[PDB]
């Protein structure tokens, strides 16, 4: 079996999980940049998957026509239906949850339910996010477009960003260290970010597990779950190897290559009864929105231009 | 027993363990800039931290107004640095620096058409320019020189002109800019010096034909121009530092030819060291006429360069 | 759950693999390295596990005393017997076939057999192996003098070494490409390294295995099996943590963990069922010898004394 | 475009890659010594590499033996390199160098006890000598070194009373002797300078245990002696290099003083160069005064090294 593998997501136990399928040729760089090396290829690309990270880039790769679709009762059977693009065209592999972290000493989490909540009065000047033009608050905005439309998101982003505790800057590690650093309350990251930290040997990271705390947001009654988010993959429309690019994906949705797979980035397997890693695990059951996240895509422009309209920078 | 030092870094190179080792024994804490800031925010008063370096003069800028940094008199940083890429209060100094350059379709451009970043707002370039999102400090750190240069109404204008000819909502990385000119995305981006040296030296076909397909441009050298925008990758003594001596002495080696060389060439930027041989394919594309201007107005005035960026809806 | 490993091995899908069980907090450095730091530890090592290659080692360390019993129905019920310490003071968890390798174009494989048959004269000035020292080598020889006895191993030895293409240098991985230089006929070197030619990117090692091939010896009527050997691991005399340490050995015999923790180095299971590595697999079945492994530690200073008063440098 | 060549090298540090990138494009192609050399071999007469890089002069004689080298003439090469640390047909170079040293117990060796190699073999040593097998080249270069210096009788007569004195058959690699004394498995050990260096650096509070333990001793040093045994790490030039002058151009440039300094650092070395700053760390345990005698002596006697040490039984 071989095929080229053109991926944005790349950690070390990925090279023994491919071994074991086959030859993978493997091609890296930022998704964007991925995406636009497939455009520039033109009917010739030598790839033949595209794995990249969040669906809102798997949309991006799905606007430029880069992927055919694909029918496999293997992963139809074993990918939950809204972890996948209703069309077939890709596939999530791993997924991951946008939650809240907490200063422990700060806030009582009873205080703590919903993102929509914390447009809320009580949080001003406590809120801490990164900056709009990246790609997981795309797609938790294009989440809450889906659900609620886009007047009341508007209105949710509006008292969202008039609760800053300051200006968006830095990446998601960057939020959780400012709780630790008192600069916020309550910041708005991915829940792998956290997993990382607690797994340091550095005594200072330490120090940040101690004073901030994950709280995963939406899991009470009527508030559909926490926004979860996906890494995937889909076959290129010029595939070379196209029976053995499906068979790698259905490889990838396998027990064995689920369980290991997901463990390099202290993400959830896309697969039930696969072992979740312990740490991650500790935090407790994931409870995910039932939302396609093809919907992520879908409303990214409006995302984009709703968070613009009201000043989140 | 060696020197030592406790340095916070965003950057690092497995090209630059040895050009430490020469120095003595430097405990290494990596982290991305804000992180770091916030680290030693954290650890407040008795940060045991000696140096921190890192990446963007409007990132030394968010350290210096966290009231990281004190300030040091040392002869030979101001003997050997160029006051325009030190701070003017001896807070942080530069030790590399890049260019904010141009990129333009080999096809589709004709490279006369090019001249400075402030002609890109001319109408032509309509739906043809790409840049990366306004969030990110290169391009807080652009803007601001141009504040610094014609003051806010004329820089607004420009920023007007600029984002009216983007050729899509910025999107992805610099090097983005830059492939998606050979994808025929765009035609002109704006991105730093460094990630085209990158690609000239990729052993990866796909690299080799970007570089085919796009050149780089020097803006801003022409007759009566300034210079192009270059910015710094650069360090400061931090304010309670337990290692004080030892940590100007690391500032003072880091200024030092040897150093100089091979810290400059472990991202393809230039040695800020005139005489330090620089790296021969940066340097085949000519030699770098940088803008004068003092890089502590790259920090000065990112506020405005934020909100502006914001107001005339660059994304 | 949390440990304290001192390994020998180390591969980078590990790290996933020891994520999935828990904290694993590793120490390396090279096997005779790690046996003196546990030495000096004394009666007060933190360490809970020490993971080595060869049971040539595993000996060396049980010699030391590091070792303590124990008995886990996991581990007898999954661990063929062979492979694994009489008295449960270790277990191999990987094993490694020592092969032939002989060039395509001068040797046909009819003419192969057994290690035995390599003393023959029609060898002569064609046989490359590395130095007596290596401990594959004392493993080996220490295997014959297990089936044949001292004086026969003795007689071996005289017509291998006489057979020698070079006095002995260079590492394994050096008598293969040795074979495609033109300089021997037939090495013998673990099977592992053949595989790292194949996957090979590079062009040159490409050209190796299009000149070179594996062969199994030993796999006729009565030649008992290819000599095999394993990497694996025991718990410390004072583990400060022996439960945890008993768990991470069961966790290391589990399906899961088998099948990437052999892809790791090209290795095989111990365990039978788990998927074997393809390009590994497309090499045939093993069919090891099924001496029990701890012969190869019991007989190595017997094997040292040998190899060397034949003059094998 | 760069100045290229096609460098085999046994030796890589993640430090080394912008050493290489400031001379141009060099094009890596890494394996054990062995492996590099039947590389070549396999090659035959169009073989494109340019330099093979190779540690210890034992190696380089191996590649010599086999015929890879070419004679390079060079003004820079011959004028800065000691004449001791070169072949003396200009057929290869020493770029770094190591010193073969002793390592005693603190607590066990009194070093004034201590003084040369030779000394070693006094029956007062019996059951306290650790040194790894006689396979490996370092051992064999120190032994080709004595036989240079005293003939074949009396380094046999010395190797006897080493192997006599050696506190369990020879295993493990030249750290595990320095972490035998520290265990108490014998008393002095034989081993690379570099060694202890690492482990002097090393965060890991049991490696700090063994230099607490054990000290590093230069033999050989004392009047009327030689100085201590010295070895290299070198390359020369290819003998159908494609791109000669090239190659050529890089050893004059690795003698350099700028990369002479780094590459050394790399793993804890001595420049060869006169002057060029050693590693702080390394520069701790005092001046190396080596052995004078040319090091293409090493290999010379390699096979008559190879065949004494296994007469005597040195395993």
Known sequence: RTINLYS??????????????????????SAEELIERIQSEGANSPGDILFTVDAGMLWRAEQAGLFQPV???????????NLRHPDGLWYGFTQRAR?????????????????????????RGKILVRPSSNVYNLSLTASRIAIHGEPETRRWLQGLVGNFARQPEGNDTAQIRAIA???????????????????????????????????????????????VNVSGAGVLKNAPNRDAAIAFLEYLASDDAQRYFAEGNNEYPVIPGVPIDPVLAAHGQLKGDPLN????????????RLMNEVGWQ
Do not use: C, M
């Open 181 to 227: 650093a008192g600069i916020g309350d309550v910041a708005i990251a991915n829940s792998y970010y956290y997993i990382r930290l607690q797994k340091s040997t550095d005594p200072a990271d330490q120090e940040v597990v101690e004073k901030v705390s994950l709280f995963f947001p939406n899991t009470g009654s009527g508030e559909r779950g926490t926004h």
């Open 99 to 123: 939650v809240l972290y907490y200063s422990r000493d700060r806030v009582n989490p009873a205080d703590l339910s919903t993102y929509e909540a914390l447009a809320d009065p009580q949080w």
């Open 293 to 304: 996240v093809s919907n992520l895509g879908r409303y990214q422009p409006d995302s984009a």
């Open 8 to 29: 944005s997501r790349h950690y070390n136990t990925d090279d023994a999980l491919y071994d074991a399928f086959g030859e993978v040729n493997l091609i890296e760089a």
């Open 71 to 81: 029918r496999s009762g293997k992963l139809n059977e074993r990918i939950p239906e």
